[PDB]
Design a protein around this nucleic acid. Sequence first.
RNA 1: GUGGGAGAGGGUGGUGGAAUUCCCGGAGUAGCGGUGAAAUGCGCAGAUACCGGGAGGAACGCCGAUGGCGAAGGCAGCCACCUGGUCCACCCGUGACGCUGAGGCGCGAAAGCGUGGGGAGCAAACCGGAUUAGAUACCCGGGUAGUCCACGCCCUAAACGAUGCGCGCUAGGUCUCUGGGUCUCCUGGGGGCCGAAGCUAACGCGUUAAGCGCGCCGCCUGGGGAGUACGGCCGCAAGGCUGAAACUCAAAGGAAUUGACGGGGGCCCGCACAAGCGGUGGAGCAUGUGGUUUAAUUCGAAGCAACGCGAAGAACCUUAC
RNA 2: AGGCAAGGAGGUAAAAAUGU
RNA 3: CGCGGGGUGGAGCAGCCUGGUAGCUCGUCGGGCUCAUAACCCGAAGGUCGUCGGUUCAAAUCCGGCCCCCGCAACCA
Lengths: 119, 164, 73, 155
Amino acid sequence: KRQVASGRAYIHASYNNTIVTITDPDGNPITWSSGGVIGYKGSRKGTPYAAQLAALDAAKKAMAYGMQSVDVIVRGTGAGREQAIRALQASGLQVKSIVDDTPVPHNGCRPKKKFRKAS
Amino acid sequence: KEYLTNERIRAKQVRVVGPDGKQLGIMDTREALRLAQEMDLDLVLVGPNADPPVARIMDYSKWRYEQQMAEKEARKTEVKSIKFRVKIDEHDYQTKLGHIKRFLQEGHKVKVTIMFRGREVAHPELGERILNRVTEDLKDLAVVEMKPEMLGRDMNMLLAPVKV
Amino acid sequence: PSRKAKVKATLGEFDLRDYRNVEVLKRFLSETGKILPRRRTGLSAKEQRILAKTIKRARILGLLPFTEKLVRK
Amino acid sequence: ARRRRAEVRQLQPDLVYGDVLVTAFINKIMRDGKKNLAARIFYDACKIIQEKTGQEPLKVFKQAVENVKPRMEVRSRRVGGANYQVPMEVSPRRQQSLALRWLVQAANQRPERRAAVRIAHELMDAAEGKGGAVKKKEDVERMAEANRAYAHYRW
RNA sequence: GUGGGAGAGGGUGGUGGAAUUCCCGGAGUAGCGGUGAAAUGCGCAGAUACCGGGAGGAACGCCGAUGGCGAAGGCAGCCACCUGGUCCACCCGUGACGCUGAGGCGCGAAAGCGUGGGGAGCAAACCGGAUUAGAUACCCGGGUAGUCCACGCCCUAAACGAUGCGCGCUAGGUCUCUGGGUCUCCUGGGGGCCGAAGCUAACGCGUUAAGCGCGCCGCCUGGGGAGUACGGCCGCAAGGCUGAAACUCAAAGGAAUUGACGGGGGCCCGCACAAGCGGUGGAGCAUGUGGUUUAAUUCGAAGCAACGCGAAGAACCUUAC
RNA sequence: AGGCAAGGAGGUAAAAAUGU
RNA sequence: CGCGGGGUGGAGCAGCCUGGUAGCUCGUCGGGCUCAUAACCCGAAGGUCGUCGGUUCAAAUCCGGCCCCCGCAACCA
Ligand SMILES: [Mg+2]
Ligand SMILES: [Mg+2]
Ligand SMILES: [Mg+2]
Ligand SMILES: [Mg+2]
Ligand SMILES: [Mg+2]
Ligand SMILES: [Mg+2]
Ligand SMILES: [Mg+2]
Ligand SMILES: [Mg+2]
Ligand SMILES: [Mg+2]
Ligand SMILES: [Mg+2]
Ligand SMILES: [Mg+2]
Ligand SMILES: [Mg+2]
Ligand SMILES: [Mg+2]
Ligand SMILES: [Mg+2]
Ligand SMILES: [Mg+2]
Ligand SMILES: [Mg+2]
Ligand SMILES: [Mg+2]
Ligand SMILES: [Mg+2]
Ligand SMILES: [Mg+2]
């Protein structure tokens, strides 16, 4: 509808779901895909295969904007981050690089007891 | 829970009861199906093993959904106990009262117990003084089904919501 | 089990405390904007600590990176 | 079962052709240890096949088997209280066995009259790409593919 | 004293990015969140994810250690300032000025409270959702106090090395940090680990002693009762410090050992499950039992290892009722 | 290409009250 | 006396409301599990919807009486 051919892909990976955002080289996201995008509601939503599927969908969507020249930024630790990456690699898209932008606090505010109990 | 929808019927000639409840008779299966298609809502066989196959012409899926919703609503309604002691802390009492009120608002019963030991002197009296006071406090929310009855080692009340 | 190089030894004699000498401290960070450990650097403990301090100072200025995102991984 | 990979039995192949697969199929068909009944049944089926689709039923049988052969199916592993249909591979011989079993099942699910006949029909259906056994196989595959989600829970 | 060192030692004044959250701006669409599964939850007023900027408040990733420091509580971004303690070399000055410490005075985490401020995250209570027999819990969603500051209090703690401080002595080896040296090895002061003698109830300790001593102070003299009561003192309170007895029990205890045990670990095994085939449970009947009747339904057998079992032969017999 | 190791993942280690 | 609302297998609750369509939990029975009990799972039994009756093709359902339950207005109490 407005096109680009070049840009990025933020793989946000949680345990509960892995979402792939596909943006331009600026930071204007055009094309995103989630677990609930591929039907998978619940546990599977965040499982590797689901993540992969989401990634594939995102790639396909991007291709509907001529998009080849995509950089890939892996944000966060999740089960599907590697699988998503693999999917992207497979896809048929011009993957620039597999950069890793994990959002790790430089000792930030006290996390929830759960993700904590880390001490 | 679950009936034969429009074309799931080979039950020959059907009791054409709409979602309205109106009889169109003993139509063919096919005729009935056609009608359903035209009317948009499915000929669902609520009694295939009957005097004509009871062809209730509502959307089956929609009907199911409705039923589900109703069921869900039914759950959300329940008994909530507030167990005092004979000796009362006033702040605590207040808090309990508030909780009871909240429960009643929500739609939920408040069975208001006390905890008695032995020492059954002014124990029952104390219980009465407590529970009755509590009732007085929140008459707007609940009125008492069960008065402060002796349970030997408890004093039970049941505050039941004013309107349903 | 780790035997490839020593950032101390691959390097010649210099001033650790010199933080503006920023090209040379870049060796003591990883590929990420992170300090290399005692075990990868192989400086004296004291020396190591001094280096770390210098790195921190540099970062605070703006000369060295505070963090990176790991590439191509 | 614990120690060794437990050896798979080599049979006398068919005395009418020279095929172990055929023998296996006959055995599967055979309930109660009534082989020289089920062998007869098998040959009747073969004859029926010949009468209809006029190829040497052995080849036809093979084709049918190939058609039913599943490659990924579902086991069941409980994980966190939830039971999962774990989609994994099926090993060659095992897969073949499964296919054979399915064929037999289909033959005995069929509403047609006699022993040979049903089997023959089933085989023909399998060859075609339709019938009961094939359908079952397809369903199994789907179950793998509907639950490809859990894959990583490999054994 | 002089010279030199290390250090998250303490305080005061600043600052630096990551992160989170919150808002503005975009770009964009059907969910995100969450979990063992889910559900509440938020979202079309357009979230979640992504970029840009701002507002903050807390906390300091990597270094990082098994490390350093303090007397202990404790202490981590970095910088500056104020400053404590300490170690070493020289052996230079001083000459016994020392060690301890009832009481005293001071410190003292966390929580707590008082007053004022702030408040992003987290988060008791609390409101929800699940979970469950129940759920006032573990799990999830929110959420106030409180975490943060200033000022005041409070003073407890597994305030632990569960080891009071000082000095002398009595094998080494090892790794470490730190200081001097004539520096592949010496010599100081820390921090660990392994061990000579010795000790110890063993465990273990073992030059950083729990060994040999000497100095001194604290405390113990069975467990509960009980850190309770009573009094006293302190405290805004919460409480704390000081601290019994009556009665009661003939144990409470520690350390090991042998087992047994564990929803501890590892290595193993069995038709133990899986894979496969065929059954029982459903039907009738055959029995044996349980139970109930009866004049008696003889007695025995009890989860596997009782139940088509003693019975390998009950019409009378057998047979015991 | 294989050899391991050290690290970082992430998955899995569900639940399940009692006793003469 | 008024008015309101209610009445469902043994107990608590949905349905009425939308004329055809009786669920849910607790208990009762039987079985399984277990060493044994609880819990757990499985079945089984069990409701004509107060009633007279009407409807209507057909009512738990729509209508009323009567019976009640419930609160309040109410004198002797
Ligand atoms: Mg000096
Ligand atoms: Mg917006
Ligand atoms: Mg120290
Ligand atoms: Mg001198
Ligand atoms: Mg002193
Ligand atoms: Mg003193
Ligand atoms: Mg206040
Ligand atoms: Mg929270
Ligand atoms: Mg709940
Ligand atoms: Mg709750
Ligand atoms: Mg919470
Ligand atoms: Mg405060
Ligand atoms: Mg002590
Ligand atoms: Mg030493
Ligand atoms: Mg030792
Ligand atoms: Mg001793
Ligand atoms: Mg105390
Ligand atoms: Mg012991
Ligand atoms: Mg089996």
